[PDB]
């Protein structure tokens, strides 16, 4: 998120990391992207543009919100 | 001799009847005190293929 905000036109949003022990070394490389950091899935939900539009700018902001909503649940 | 005349055409009034608002012919009316004494015959068969049914005097009206 802190990299997508810098270049939202060319950076692909990451949904979450992929931990699959059935993967082969080629699959690990094919799914490694979005600043590398290991195999990850790109997000098509639109939360990156949404949170960015509403003022979210840092992972600290995202972390705090997560805690709040967990408390609300 | 209670009931409609034999051979007369009457319209069914029983709501759950296949011939509701339809006209049939009075085959016979049982003078004995049966719950449904009017035997009516219809040209169109029902979903079961039956073309006759018994109705009470109130369930039938000349039409």
């Amino acid at each position: 998120f802190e990299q997508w905000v810098t270049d939202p036109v060319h950076i692909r949003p990451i949904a979450h990391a992929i931990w699959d022990p059935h993967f082969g070394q080629p699959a690990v490389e094919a799914f490694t992207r979005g600043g590398a950091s290991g195999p990850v899935n790109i997000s098509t939900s639109g939360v990156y543009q949404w949170w960015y539009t509403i003022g979210m700018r840092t992972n600290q902001d995202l972390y705090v919100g997560s805690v709040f909503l967990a408390l609300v649940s | 001799e209670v009931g409609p005349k034999r051979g007369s055409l009457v319209k069914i009034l029983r709501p759950e009847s296949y011939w509701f608002n339809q006209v049939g012919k009075v085959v016979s009316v049982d003078q004995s005190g049966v719950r449904y004494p009017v035997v009516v015959r219809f040209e169109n068969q029902n979903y079961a293929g039956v073309t006759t049914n018994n109705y009470a005097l109130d369930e039938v009206v000349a039409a």
Binding site: - | E16, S17, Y18, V34, Y36, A48, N54
Partner: protein, 80 residues
Amino acid sequence: AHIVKIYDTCIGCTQCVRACPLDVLEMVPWDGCKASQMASAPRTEDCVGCKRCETACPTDFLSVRVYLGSESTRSMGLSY
């Protein structure tokens, strides 16, 4: 067990009793129809829900009605 019910529209044709493949019905003396007999359902616990009785019923609407209910080894017609 399935709920089997007989209605006053019964004409005492006995067709349902002859069609039943599990002996759930029988004919009992009656005074409401010319046949002086009406169908009864004293063994519904053996009913499976085939609805053959309803197929045999010639009245409009049906005088015998089957309502599928709680399922048992007999209701599911299980030989195991």
